[PDB]
Design a protein around this ligand. Sequence first.
Ligand code: NAP
Ligand code: NAP
Lengths: 285, 285
Amino acid sequence: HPPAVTVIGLGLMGSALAAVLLDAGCPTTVWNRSAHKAQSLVDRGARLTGTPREAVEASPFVIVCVLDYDVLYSVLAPSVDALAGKVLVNLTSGSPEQAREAMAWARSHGADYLDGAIMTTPPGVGSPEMMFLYGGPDDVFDAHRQTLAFLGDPLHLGDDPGLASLYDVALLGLMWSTLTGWLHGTALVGAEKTSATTFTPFAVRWLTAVAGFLTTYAPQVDAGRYPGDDATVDVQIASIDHLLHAAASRGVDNALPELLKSVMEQARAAGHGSDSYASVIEVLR
Amino acid sequence: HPPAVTVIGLGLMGSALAAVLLDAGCPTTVWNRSAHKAQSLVDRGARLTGTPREAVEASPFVIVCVLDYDVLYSVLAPSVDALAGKVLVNLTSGSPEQAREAMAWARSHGADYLDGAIMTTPPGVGSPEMMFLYGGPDDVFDAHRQTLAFLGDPLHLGDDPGLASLYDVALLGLMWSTLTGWLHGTALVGAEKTSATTFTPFAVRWLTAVAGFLTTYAPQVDAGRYPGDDATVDVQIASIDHLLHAAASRGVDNALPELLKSVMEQARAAGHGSDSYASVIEVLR
Ligand SMILES: NC(=O)c1ccc[n+]([C@@H]2O[C@H](COP(=O)([O-])OP(=O)(O)OC[C@H]3O[C@@H](n4cnc5c(N)ncnc54)[C@H](OP(=O)(O)O)[C@@H]3O)[C@@H](O)[C@H]2O)c1
Ligand SMILES: NC(=O)c1ccc[n+]([C@@H]2O[C@H](COP(=O)([O-])OP(=O)(O)OC[C@H]3O[C@@H](n4cnc5c(N)ncnc54)[C@H](OP(=O)(O)O)[C@@H]3O)[C@@H](O)[C@H]2O)c1
């Protein structure tokens, strides 16, 4: 017994959301500035409207997934009178401050609001292993959980809508850091004719052990105390110089590991040479 | 039946190697510049020698795990006459160039040689899930695999000893990048009273999906072609600005995500705004 659902925004991610809702048996209505992106969805049973307003009017449950929140206000400004009694689930990326403003704005026009963060690329939409993080009122999340569950694993962080976006940017920073370090290392072994496809399964496996380091170091970060029982900042400064040397000789730009070395040196200068790497957080605050 | 084994270097890692060998039933001999670090090992059945030479003479199988390769040459130079017929397994961190030199040097004194990289902190030594990467001759690795298996999962990368260290520095760079991005995000959510121990399980889970991004992007890196089918560099530049804004307002140093943004901007300027993030490798060569 799924409800009628509308998706506003049919980009890479918006499309995928609409396709999953469609396959889950929802009557699916869509809108996008560029109508051509709807074509494949329409062929499969989605209704395309000419304007956002008609799309909003067509369903009690409205998802937005556009570039940013300015665009959201821009495309929905003409529909504000039609929002009353609706639920608006905003899966657009933004900052905590934008998320809290958007909730106030939606409530001012009589709509229920949840702010969400999609922790997957488009192929994983629909997979219950992929996290979707939500902030907003309990009641709204509980009433709509079953529909959200179509898209992935819906995790309600709490009543503050900014929480979703807070976790999101923190998690994205983690992702960009990992991707770039991976790419740097891949360039390095690649200069020796080791293919990325050969190296990467070792990287993937290694990330399991690295995730274990995160688990170990969490209670250290909360305590502000970083015992060097496993490996020390000083030892890590010595080994990063091997990375820098190897990369420099193979034509790989070292901005990233230079910065990481500097951050370790900063922590050492602050008295953390014999502490664990988690002590590096002392020089990020 | 396990062989007699010597460990040279009883730091955080060297200790752990010796403790595992001891528990596996090996007659275990040890040496360290600072003898007091041997005490707990001696109490449990390890023999401590006064010099490295006596330690080398005591076993057919010698592991070295000291700060760096200069220290290795320094402590082993006086034992070169005792190396003949031995196997020397060097688990010291270093560069590929150092690894190849060390093999030539060990061969010149009649020893078999393997170069290794420990992909775990000390607690994981002994666990068959933890990767130990090896480079050096097939025959040597095959003859000694059973002893190496006591320490972890021994993976022979091939005949070139520099391969172990090549993968190692690349993998360490990945680890440092991940840890620092994790810590930056942890600082961020921590300003809002979300503990590291609350945030980290989300980070760990997220890393599974990120590892999947690495798998997808590997064939793109090898091809030099980066289709923007999932998510684009331009969209990622927009979302990293939400991270920068959120972090700046909460007293978190933004050197890291500023560099990551710059790297994405560099890729965009080179024509990769519509490509996947893997295109960023184009700007690291
Ligand atoms: N792709 C991912 O893996 C992923 C994952 C998690 C979160 N997200 C987030 O989801 C959101 C959308 O991302 P996407 O990857 O789907 O990006 P995308 O393919 O570039 O789509 C951007 C969407 O915004 C619309 N748009 C942009 N400017 C507009 C304007 N001035 N007026 C009306 N519509 C406008 C686009 O319409 P046109 O089609 O007419 O240009 C399109 O629907 C972003 O906040 C992104 O950070 C993406
Ligand atoms: N800990 C880890 O998690 C880990 C993981 C993988 C690889 N590694 C690598 O293992 C190696 C040793 O690491 P560790 O973590 O055991 O660090 P550590 O606890 O600082 O050990 C350093 C070792 O080197 C010796 N040493 C240093 N300078 C010396 C000198 N001038 N003469 C003689 N001996 C000297 C030390 O002897 P004293 O005790 O007398 O100072 C000690 O045995 C490094 O290459 C490191 O990158 C470590």
